[PDB]
PDB file of C-alpha atoms in Angstrom:
ATOM      1  CA  UNK Y 263     -22.786 -29.032   7.937  1.00  0.00           C
ATOM      2  CA  UNK Y 264     -18.912 -28.239   8.019  1.00  0.00           C
ATOM      3  CA  UNK Y 265     -17.132 -25.539   8.897  1.00  0.00           C
ATOM      4  CA  UNK Y 266     -14.063 -24.174   7.868  1.00  0.00           C
ATOM      5  CA  UNK Y 267     -10.513 -23.740   9.781  1.00  0.00           C
ATOM      6  CA  UNK Y 268      -7.379 -22.109   9.631  1.00  0.00           C
ATOM      7  CA  UNK Y 269      -5.330 -25.505   8.815  1.00  0.00           C
ATOM      8  CA  UNK Y 270      -2.224 -24.760   6.901  1.00  0.00           C
ATOM      9  CA  UNK Y 271      -0.291 -21.247   6.462  1.00  0.00           C
ATOM     10  CA  UNK Y 272       2.903 -21.463   5.171  1.00  0.00           C
ATOM     11  CA  UNK Y 273       5.227 -18.662   3.594  1.00  0.00           C
ATOM     12  CA  UNK Y 274       7.428 -19.007   0.489  1.00  0.00           C
ATOM     13  CA  UNK Y 275       8.984 -15.799   0.479  1.00  0.00           C
ATOM     14  CA  UNK Y 276       9.406 -13.276   2.762  1.00  0.00           C
ATOM     15  CA  UNK Y 277       6.642 -11.189   1.025  1.00  0.00           C
ATOM     16  CA  UNK Y 278       3.697 -13.390   0.322  1.00  0.00           C
ATOM     17  CA  UNK Y 279       2.192 -16.824   2.080  1.00  0.00           C
ATOM     18  CA  UNK Y 280      -0.411 -19.449   1.295  1.00  0.00           C
ATOM     19  CA  UNK Y 281      -2.919 -19.707   3.972  1.00  0.00           C
ATOM     20  CA  UNK Y 282      -5.439 -22.770   3.353  1.00  0.00           C
ATOM     21  CA  UNK Y 283      -8.791 -23.379   5.360  1.00  0.00           C
ATOM     22  CA  UNK Y 284      -9.166 -27.010   4.688  1.00  0.00           C
ATOM     23  CA  UNK Y 285     -13.463 -28.392   5.327  1.00  0.00           C
ATOM     24  CA  UNK Y 286     -15.822 -26.050   2.640  1.00  0.00           C
ATOM     25  CA  UNK Y 287     -19.263 -27.636   1.423  1.00  0.00           C
ATOM     26  CA  UNK Y 288     -19.485 -26.985  -2.421  1.00  0.00           C
ATOM     27  CA  UNK Y 289     -20.034 -23.554  -3.037  1.00  0.00           C
ATOM     28  CA  UNK Y 290     -18.923 -22.441  -0.381  1.00  0.00           C
ATOM     29  CA  UNK Y 291     -15.473 -22.767  -1.621  1.00  0.00           C
ATOM     30  CA  UNK Y 292     -16.444 -19.758  -3.988  1.00  0.00           C
ATOM     31  CA  UNK Y 293     -18.610 -18.004  -1.946  1.00  0.00           C
ATOM     32  CA  UNK Y 294     -15.917 -17.005   0.454  1.00  0.00           C
ATOM     33  CA  UNK Y 295     -12.886 -17.391  -1.695  1.00  0.00           C
ATOM     34  CA  UNK Y 296     -14.731 -14.046  -3.947  1.00  0.00           C
ATOM     35  CA  UNK Y 297     -15.654 -12.374  -0.465  1.00  0.00           C
ATOM     36  CA  UNK Y 298     -12.064 -12.662   1.541  1.00  0.00           C
ATOM     37  CA  UNK Y 299     -10.745 -11.005  -1.234  1.00  0.00           C
ATOM     38  CA  UNK Y 300     -12.542  -8.118  -2.252  1.00  0.00           C
ATOM     39  CA  UNK Y 301     -12.561  -8.060   1.423  1.00  0.00           C
ATOM     40  CA  UNK Y 302      -8.812  -7.961   1.691  1.00  0.00           C
ATOM     41  CA  UNK Y 303      -8.251  -5.960  -1.363  1.00  0.00           C
ATOM     42  CA  UNK Y 304     -10.046  -2.504  -0.221  1.00  0.00           C
ATOM     43  CA  UNK Y 305      -9.590  -2.192   3.631  1.00  0.00           C
ATOM     44  CA  UNK Y 306      -6.550  -2.935   5.481  1.00  0.00           C
ATOM     45  CA  UNK Y 307      -5.031  -1.424   8.053  1.00  0.00           C
ATOM     46  CA  UNK Y 308      -0.893  -0.224   7.002  1.00  0.00           C
ATOM     47  CA  UNK Y 309       0.817   2.446   7.970  1.00  0.00           C
ATOM     48  CA  UNK Y 310       2.507   4.626   5.046  1.00  0.00           C
ATOM     49  CA  UNK Y 311       4.468   8.398   5.415  1.00  0.00           C
ATOM     50  CA  UNK Y 312       2.050  10.780   5.275  1.00  0.00           C
ATOM     51  CA  UNK Y 313       4.746  14.455   5.952  1.00  0.00           C
ATOM     52  CA  UNK Y 314       8.166  14.542   4.947  1.00  0.00           C
ATOM     53  CA  UNK Y 315       9.694  17.941   6.049  1.00  0.00           C
ATOM     54  CA  UNK Y 316      13.377  18.134   4.537  1.00  0.00           C
ATOM     55  CA  UNK Y 317      16.142  20.732   6.553  1.00  0.00           C
ATOM     56  CA  UNK Y 318      16.785  22.979   3.525  1.00  0.00           C
ATOM     57  CA  UNK Y 319      14.085  22.593   1.116  1.00  0.00           C
ATOM     58  CA  UNK Y 320      10.874  25.217   1.005  1.00  0.00           C
ATOM     59  CA  UNK Y 321       8.744  23.210  -1.265  1.00  0.00           C
ATOM     60  CA  UNK Y 322       8.762  20.177  -3.380  1.00  0.00           C
ATOM     61  CA  UNK Y 323       9.933  21.334  -7.109  1.00  0.00           C
ATOM     62  CA  UNK Y 324      13.580  22.897  -5.931  1.00  0.00           C
ATOM     63  CA  UNK Y 325      16.966  20.655  -6.415  1.00  0.00           C
ATOM     64  CA  UNK Y 326      19.176  20.042  -3.393  1.00  0.00           C
ATOM     65  CA  UNK Y 327      23.161  20.493  -4.444  1.00  0.00           C
ATOM     66  CA  UNK Y 328      24.655  17.069  -4.012  1.00  0.00           C
ATOM     67  CA  UNK Y 329      21.974  15.123  -4.672  1.00  0.00           C
ATOM     68  CA  UNK Y 330      21.432  13.044  -7.737  1.00  0.00           C
ATOM     69  CA  UNK Y 331      17.918  12.799  -7.397  1.00  0.00           C
ATOM     70  CA  UNK Y 332      15.622  15.435  -7.566  1.00  0.00           C
ATOM     71  CA  UNK Y 333      13.200  15.878  -3.945  1.00  0.00           C
ATOM     72  CA  UNK Y 334      10.312  14.614  -5.800  1.00  0.00           C
ATOM     73  CA  UNK Y 335      11.885  11.769  -6.888  1.00  0.00           C
ATOM     74  CA  UNK Y 336      12.844  11.756  -3.248  1.00  0.00           C
ATOM     75  CA  UNK Y 337       9.359  11.930  -2.032  1.00  0.00           C
ATOM     76  CA  UNK Y 338       7.967   9.132  -4.367  1.00  0.00           C
ATOM     77  CA  UNK Y 339      10.598   6.982  -3.220  1.00  0.00           C
ATOM     78  CA  UNK Y 340       9.671   7.925   0.405  1.00  0.00           C
ATOM     79  CA  UNK Y 341       5.908   6.911  -0.529  1.00  0.00           C
ATOM     80  CA  UNK Y 342       6.537   3.277  -1.212  1.00  0.00           C
ATOM     81  CA  UNK Y 343       8.037   2.942   1.594  1.00  0.00           C
ATOM     82  CA  UNK Y 344       7.385  -0.393   3.971  1.00  0.00           C
ATOM     83  CA  UNK Y 345       7.765  -0.035   7.594  1.00  0.00           C
ATOM     84  CA  UNK Y 346       5.316  -1.021  10.708  1.00  0.00           C
ATOM     85  CA  UNK Y 347       4.707   0.666  13.533  1.00  0.00           C
ATOM     86  CA  UNK Y 348       3.118  -1.162  17.462  1.00  0.00           C
ATOM     87  CA  UNK Y 349       2.108   0.983  19.693  1.00  0.00           C
ATOM     88  CA  UNK Y 350       1.423   4.563  18.627  1.00  0.00           C
ATOM     89  CA  UNK Y 351      -0.981   5.767  16.068  1.00  0.00           C
ATOM     90  CA  UNK Y 352       1.772   7.773  14.597  1.00  0.00           C
ATOM     91  CA  UNK Y 353       5.007   8.410  14.504  1.00  0.00           C
ATOM     92  CA  UNK Y 354       7.851  11.030  13.715  1.00  0.00           C
ATOM     93  CA  UNK Y 355      10.869   9.081  11.790  1.00  0.00           C
ATOM     94  CA  UNK Y 356      13.947  11.001  11.349  1.00  0.00           C
ATOM     95  CA  UNK Y 357      17.164  10.536   8.717  1.00  0.00           C
ATOM     96  CA  UNK Y 358      20.737  11.880   9.291  1.00  0.00           C
ATOM     97  CA  UNK Y 359      22.681  11.110   6.384  1.00  0.00           C
ATOM     98  CA  UNK Y 360      26.501  12.394   5.440  1.00  0.00           C
ATOM     99  CA  UNK Y 361      29.154  11.585   2.656  1.00  0.00           C
ATOM    100  CA  UNK Y 362      29.028  10.093  -1.009  1.00  0.00           C
ATOM    101  CA  UNK Y 363      27.484   7.425  -1.040  1.00  0.00           C
ATOM    102  CA  UNK Y 364      23.783   5.910  -1.629  1.00  0.00           C
ATOM    103  CA  UNK Y 365      21.658   6.123   1.183  1.00  0.00           C
ATOM    104  CA  UNK Y 366      19.124   3.662   2.286  1.00  0.00           C
ATOM    105  CA  UNK Y 367      16.226   3.013   5.031  1.00  0.00           C
ATOM    106  CA  UNK Y 368      18.587   1.047   7.259  1.00  0.00           C
ATOM    107  CA  UNK Y 369      20.079   4.774   7.977  1.00  0.00           C
ATOM    108  CA  UNK Y 370      16.676   5.684   9.409  1.00  0.00           C
ATOM    109  CA  UNK Y 371      17.574   5.975  13.621  1.00  0.00           C
ATOM    110  CA  UNK Y 372      14.664   3.079  15.154  1.00  0.00           C
ATOM    111  CA  UNK Y 373      12.705   3.835  18.256  1.00  0.00           C
ATOM    112  CA  UNK Y 374      11.621   1.027  20.194  1.00  0.00           C
ATOM    113  CA  UNK Y 375       7.970   0.162  17.579  1.00  0.00           C
ATOM    114  CA  UNK Y 376       8.842   1.879  14.461  1.00  0.00           C
ATOM    115  CA  UNK Y 377      10.869  -1.112  12.992  1.00  0.00           C
ATOM    116  CA  UNK Y 378      11.767  -1.348   8.748  1.00  0.00           C
ATOM    117  CA  UNK Y 379      10.944  -4.421   7.082  1.00  0.00           C
ATOM    118  CA  UNK Y 380      13.042  -3.554   3.936  1.00  0.00           C
ATOM    119  CA  UNK Y 381      16.264  -1.980   4.543  1.00  0.00           C
ATOM    120  CA  UNK Y 382      17.786  -2.384   1.157  1.00  0.00           C
ATOM    121  CA  UNK Y 383      15.165   0.677  -0.630  1.00  0.00           C
ATOM    122  CA  UNK Y 384      16.857   3.299  -1.543  1.00  0.00           C
ATOM    123  CA  UNK Y 385      15.756   6.748  -0.877  1.00  0.00           C
ATOM    124  CA  UNK Y 386      18.358   8.980  -2.740  1.00  0.00           C
ATOM    125  CA  UNK Y 387      21.978   9.218  -3.548  1.00  0.00           C
ATOM    126  CA  UNK Y 388      25.076  11.345  -2.173  1.00  0.00           C
ATOM    127  CA  UNK Y 389      27.228  12.385  -4.876  1.00  0.00           C
ATOM    128  CA  UNK Y 390      29.310  15.171  -3.190  1.00  0.00           C
ATOM    129  CA  UNK Y 391      31.622  14.464  -0.598  1.00  0.00           C
ATOM    130  CA  UNK Y 392      30.521  17.178   1.841  1.00  0.00           C
ATOM    131  CA  UNK Y 393      26.970  17.017   1.098  1.00  0.00           C
ATOM    132  CA  UNK Y 394      24.284  16.141   4.662  1.00  0.00           C
ATOM    133  CA  UNK Y 395      20.710  15.791   4.264  1.00  0.00           C
ATOM    134  CA  UNK Y 396      18.106  15.519   7.272  1.00  0.00           C
ATOM    135  CA  UNK Y 397      13.968  14.752   7.021  1.00  0.00           C
ATOM    136  CA  UNK Y 398      11.563  14.074   9.278  1.00  0.00           C
ATOM    137  CA  UNK Y 399       9.098  11.381   7.869  1.00  0.00           C
ATOM    138  CA  UNK Y 400       5.553  11.437  10.045  1.00  0.00           C
ATOM    139  CA  UNK Y 401       3.821   7.529   9.308  1.00  0.00           C
ATOM    140  CA  UNK Y 402       0.578   6.608  11.100  1.00  0.00           C
ATOM    141  CA  UNK Y 403      -1.872   4.432  10.014  1.00  0.00           C
ATOM    142  CA  UNK Y 404      -4.996   4.436   8.050  1.00  0.00           C
ATOM    143  CA  UNK Y 405      -7.388   2.587   5.714  1.00  0.00           C
ATOM    144  CA  UNK Y 406      -7.515   2.339   1.734  1.00  0.00           C
ATOM    145  CA  UNK Y 407      -5.687   5.641  -0.435  1.00  0.00           C
ATOM    146  CA  UNK Y 408      -6.151   9.041   0.333  1.00  0.00           C
ATOM    147  CA  UNK Y 409      -5.095  11.613  -1.399  1.00  0.00           C
ATOM    148  CA  UNK Y 410      -2.586  14.516  -0.276  1.00  0.00           C
ATOM    149  CA  UNK Y 411      -5.255  17.194  -1.659  1.00  0.00           C
ATOM    150  CA  UNK Y 412      -8.247  15.762  -0.197  1.00  0.00           C
ATOM    151  CA  UNK Y 413      -6.176  15.913   3.438  1.00  0.00           C
ATOM    152  CA  UNK Y 414       0.788  24.628   7.525  1.00  0.00           C
ATOM    153  CA  UNK Y 415       4.168  26.289   7.570  1.00  0.00           C
ATOM    154  CA  UNK Y 416       5.676  26.611   3.675  1.00  0.00           C
ATOM    155  CA  UNK Y 417       9.236  23.946   4.755  1.00  0.00           C
ATOM    156  CA  UNK Y 418       6.417  20.984   5.137  1.00  0.00           C
ATOM    157  CA  UNK Y 419       5.657  18.960   1.939  1.00  0.00           C
ATOM    158  CA  UNK Y 420       2.724  16.881   1.549  1.00  0.00           C
ATOM    159  CA  UNK Y 421       2.751  12.850   0.370  1.00  0.00           C
ATOM    160  CA  UNK Y 422      -0.054  11.242  -1.014  1.00  0.00           C
ATOM    161  CA  UNK Y 423      -1.115   7.657   1.454  1.00  0.00           C
ATOM    162  CA  UNK Y 424      -1.538   4.399   0.294  1.00  0.00           C
ATOM    163  CA  UNK Y 425      -1.918   2.410   3.077  1.00  0.00           C
ATOM    164  CA  UNK Y 426      -2.757  -0.790   1.721  1.00  0.00           C
ATOM    165  CA  UNK Y 427      -0.846  -3.797   3.015  1.00  0.00           C
ATOM    166  CA  UNK Y 428      -1.985  -6.074   0.261  1.00  0.00           C
ATOM    167  CA  UNK Y 429      -1.143  -6.191  -3.109  1.00  0.00           C
ATOM    168  CA  UNK Y 430      -2.441  -9.278  -5.078  1.00  0.00           C
ATOM    169  CA  UNK Y 431      -4.650 -11.046  -3.653  1.00  0.00           C
ATOM    170  CA  UNK Y 432      -5.363 -14.440  -5.981  1.00  0.00           C
ATOM    171  CA  UNK Y 433      -7.040 -17.581  -4.898  1.00  0.00           C
ATOM    172  CA  UNK Y 434      -7.998 -21.038  -5.887  1.00  0.00           C
ATOM    173  CA  UNK Y 435     -10.791 -24.245  -5.011  1.00  0.00           C
ATOM    174  CA  UNK Y 436      -8.814 -27.470  -4.756  1.00  0.00           C
ATOM    175  CA  UNK Y 437     -11.138 -30.373  -3.850  1.00  0.00           C
ATOM    176  CA  UNK Y 438     -10.257 -32.074  -0.795  1.00  0.00           C
ATOM    177  CA  UNK Y 439      -8.929 -35.598   0.204  1.00  0.00           C
ATOM    178  CA  UNK Y 440     -11.283 -36.830   2.833  1.00  0.00           C
ATOM    179  CA  UNK Y 441     -10.784 -40.348   3.236  1.00  0.00           C
ATOM    180  CA  UNK Y 442     -14.913 -40.388   3.613  1.00  0.00           C
ATOM    181  CA  UNK Y 443     -16.440 -37.652   1.840  1.00  0.00           C
ATOM    182  CA  UNK Y 444     -16.948 -35.734  -0.986  1.00  0.00           C
ATOM    183  CA  UNK Y 445     -17.633 -32.439  -2.846  1.00  0.00           C
ATOM    184  CA  UNK Y 446     -15.815 -31.148  -0.141  1.00  0.00           C
ATOM    185  CA  UNK Y 447     -13.323 -28.790  -1.336  1.00  0.00           C
ATOM    186  CA  UNK Y 448     -10.027 -26.948   0.341  1.00  0.00           C
ATOM    187  CA  UNK Y 449      -9.259 -23.296  -0.077  1.00  0.00           C
ATOM    188  CA  UNK Y 450      -6.019 -21.664  -0.654  1.00  0.00           C
ATOM    189  CA  UNK Y 451      -5.450 -18.014  -0.854  1.00  0.00           C
ATOM    190  CA  UNK Y 452      -2.431 -16.181  -2.273  1.00  0.00           C
ATOM    191  CA  UNK Y 453      -1.513 -12.592  -0.632  1.00  0.00           C
ATOM    192  CA  UNK Y 454       1.603 -11.286  -1.769  1.00  0.00           C
ATOM    193  CA  UNK Y 455       2.113  -8.695   0.609  1.00  0.00           C
ATOM    194  CA  UNK Y 456       4.331  -5.527   1.373  1.00  0.00           C
ATOM    195  CA  UNK Y 457       5.790  -7.136   3.957  1.00  0.00           C
ATOM    196  CA  UNK Y 458       3.785  -5.224   7.415  1.00  0.00           C
ATOM    197  CA  UNK Y 459       1.128  -7.766   7.740  1.00  0.00           C
ATOM    198  CA  UNK Y 460       1.208 -10.590   8.765  1.00  0.00           C
ATOM    199  CA  UNK Y 461      -1.026 -13.415   6.988  1.00  0.00           C
ATOM    200  CA  UNK Y 462      -3.495 -15.129   9.501  1.00  0.00           C
ATOM    201  CA  UNK Y 463      -4.448 -11.743  10.983  1.00  0.00           C
ATOM    202  CA  UNK Y 464      -4.702 -10.163   7.640  1.00  0.00           C
ATOM    203  CA  UNK Y 465      -7.212 -13.454   7.072  1.00  0.00           C
ATOM    204  CA  UNK Y 466      -9.317 -12.746  10.767  1.00  0.00           C
ATOM    205  CA  UNK Y 467      -9.136  -9.122  10.107  1.00  0.00           C
ATOM    206  CA  UNK Y 468     -10.808  -9.831   6.979  1.00  0.00           C
ATOM    207  CA  UNK Y 469     -13.486 -12.163   7.961  1.00  0.00           C
ATOM    208  CA  UNK Y 470     -14.311  -9.770  10.783  1.00  0.00           C
ATOM    209  CA  UNK Y 471     -14.952  -7.030   8.962  1.00  0.00           C
ATOM    210  CA  UNK Y 472     -17.664  -9.965   7.868  1.00  0.00           C
ATOM    211  CA  UNK Y 473     -18.184 -10.887  10.897  1.00  0.00           C
ATOM    212  CA  UNK Y 474     -19.590  -7.333  11.859  1.00  0.00           C
ATOM    213  CA  UNK Y 475     -21.454  -6.179   8.101  1.00  0.00           C
ATOM    214  CA  UNK Y 476     -23.268  -9.442   7.991  1.00  0.00           C
ATOM    215  CA  UNK Y 477     -24.674  -8.841  11.439  1.00  0.00           C
ATOM    216  CA  UNK Y 478     -27.167  -5.603   9.554  1.00  0.00           C
ATOM    217  CA  UNK Y 479     -29.620  -7.496   7.765  1.00  0.00           C
ATOM    218  CA  UNK Y 480     -29.901 -11.027  10.322  1.00  0.00           C
ATOM    219  CA  UNK Y 481     -31.030 -11.345  13.905  1.00  0.00           C
TER     220      UNK Y 481
ATOM    221  CA  UNK G 150       3.799  54.080 -18.298  1.00  0.00           C
ATOM    222  CA  UNK G 151       4.026  51.160 -15.711  1.00  0.00           C
ATOM    223  CA  UNK G 152       7.002  51.735 -12.839  1.00  0.00           C
ATOM    224  CA  UNK G 153       6.645  47.636 -11.825  1.00  0.00           C
ATOM    225  CA  UNK G 154       6.051  44.313 -12.879  1.00  0.00           C
ATOM    226  CA  UNK G 155       6.317  41.672 -10.868  1.00  0.00           C
ATOM    227  CA  UNK G 156       5.659  37.620 -11.930  1.00  0.00           C
ATOM    228  CA  UNK G 157       4.623  34.751  -9.871  1.00  0.00           C
ATOM    229  CA  UNK G 158       4.551  31.448 -11.407  1.00  0.00           C
ATOM    230  CA  UNK G 159       2.179  28.877  -9.842  1.00  0.00           C
ATOM    231  CA  UNK G 160       2.950  24.951 -10.028  1.00  0.00           C
ATOM    232  CA  UNK G 161      -0.042  22.728 -10.055  1.00  0.00           C
ATOM    233  CA  UNK G 162      -0.035  19.021 -10.436  1.00  0.00           C
ATOM    234  CA  UNK G 163      -3.027  18.094 -12.145  1.00  0.00           C
ATOM    235  CA  UNK G 164      -4.189  14.166 -12.116  1.00  0.00           C
ATOM    236  CA  UNK G 165      -6.602  12.142 -14.098  1.00  0.00           C
ATOM    237  CA  UNK G 166     -10.348  12.383 -13.556  1.00  0.00           C
ATOM    238  CA  UNK G 167     -12.772  11.023 -15.348  1.00  0.00           C
ATOM    239  CA  UNK G 168     -13.331  13.075 -18.377  1.00  0.00           C
ATOM    240  CA  UNK G 169      -9.947  13.627 -19.396  1.00  0.00           C
ATOM    241  CA  UNK G 170      -9.094  12.727 -23.198  1.00  0.00           C
ATOM    242  CA  UNK G 171      -6.917   9.992 -23.378  1.00  0.00           C
ATOM    243  CA  UNK G 172      -5.447   8.349 -26.562  1.00  0.00           C
ATOM    244  CA  UNK G 173      -3.308   5.479 -27.552  1.00  0.00           C
ATOM    245  CA  UNK G 174      -1.040   5.399 -31.007  1.00  0.00           C
ATOM    246  CA  UNK G 175      -2.626   4.020 -33.711  1.00  0.00           C
ATOM    247  CA  UNK G 176      -5.366   6.344 -33.592  1.00  0.00           C
ATOM    248  CA  UNK G 177      -7.941   5.194 -30.630  1.00  0.00           C
ATOM    249  CA  UNK G 178      -8.913   7.929 -28.663  1.00  0.00           C
ATOM    250  CA  UNK G 179     -11.539   8.142 -25.781  1.00  0.00           C
ATOM    251  CA  UNK G 180     -12.187  10.373 -22.431  1.00  0.00           C
ATOM    252  CA  UNK G 181     -12.506   7.879 -19.216  1.00  0.00           C
ATOM    253  CA  UNK G 182     -15.570   7.333 -17.717  1.00  0.00           C
ATOM    254  CA  UNK G 183     -14.536   6.297 -14.690  1.00  0.00           C
ATOM    255  CA  UNK G 184     -12.200   5.260 -11.965  1.00  0.00           C
ATOM    256  CA  UNK G 185     -13.404   1.807 -10.514  1.00  0.00           C
ATOM    257  CA  UNK G 186     -11.784   0.508  -7.409  1.00  0.00           C
ATOM    258  CA  UNK G 187      -8.922  -2.105  -7.583  1.00  0.00           C
ATOM    259  CA  UNK G 188     -11.099  -5.282  -6.685  1.00  0.00           C
ATOM    260  CA  UNK G 189     -14.072  -4.842  -9.243  1.00  0.00           C
ATOM    261  CA  UNK G 190     -11.907  -5.238 -12.318  1.00  0.00           C
ATOM    262  CA  UNK G 191     -11.502  -8.154 -13.921  1.00  0.00           C
ATOM    263  CA  UNK G 192      -8.538 -10.525 -13.094  1.00  0.00           C
ATOM    264  CA  UNK G 193      -6.868 -13.138 -14.731  1.00  0.00           C
ATOM    265  CA  UNK G 194      -5.748 -16.703 -12.898  1.00  0.00           C
ATOM    266  CA  UNK G 195      -3.210 -15.092 -11.026  1.00  0.00           C
ATOM    267  CA  UNK G 196      -4.523 -12.783  -9.399  1.00  0.00           C
ATOM    268  CA  UNK G 197      -3.262  -9.858 -11.606  1.00  0.00           C
ATOM    269  CA  UNK G 198      -6.192  -7.368 -12.465  1.00  0.00           C
TER     270      UNK G 198
END
């Protein structure tokens, strides 16, 4: 038999890359190409905001003076924030801005571990010259999509968390160019990530999951 | 015959659910039957489900 190996990883942009698994025997290239996609799209460790507490507003459906966005819009913008944490499963992010001008993810004070991958993500726009906003953001790991409903003080808002760094996975099977063999197929996987997870480690995790699952019905 | 009357407002946020009606503009209607996971959906060649 033959053994597939991670031969080439290339990144076209900052979001998505194209991993390569060169040697595969006929038929496998279309079995792994679907297993590693179904696993990848449904279970990956990602970080997303879960609890946002603003200084002065009680509940979601309350406007705040000096901010163009409704508080609901601020929450929905924050849900899409793409951040990654290194060492601690839970973290608190503090945002402090003042003066007229849009606020961005880069305005958040950065700790040693938590770093934002897209510092151009606009959260809210400040219109009045003497307006201010201060919010605490709780960011944690997770797996899959966890609605807020299924998960105390009145001044702490709840936002649904969607821990899924990968958006759009596609694969294809091209015939290999081995100098002496035939029917050998190389596999290319495209992974439109949100920018938090690395491609090679993503493939490694999505394959360890399979290696654990298969050990059920096998010695 | 009433001393004081108090009104309290509740703001539910109804999500989508198997059973909720959903209709197009052309006259096609029908209830949702299953909220399939993203991976189970069909996808074109480029990968978009």
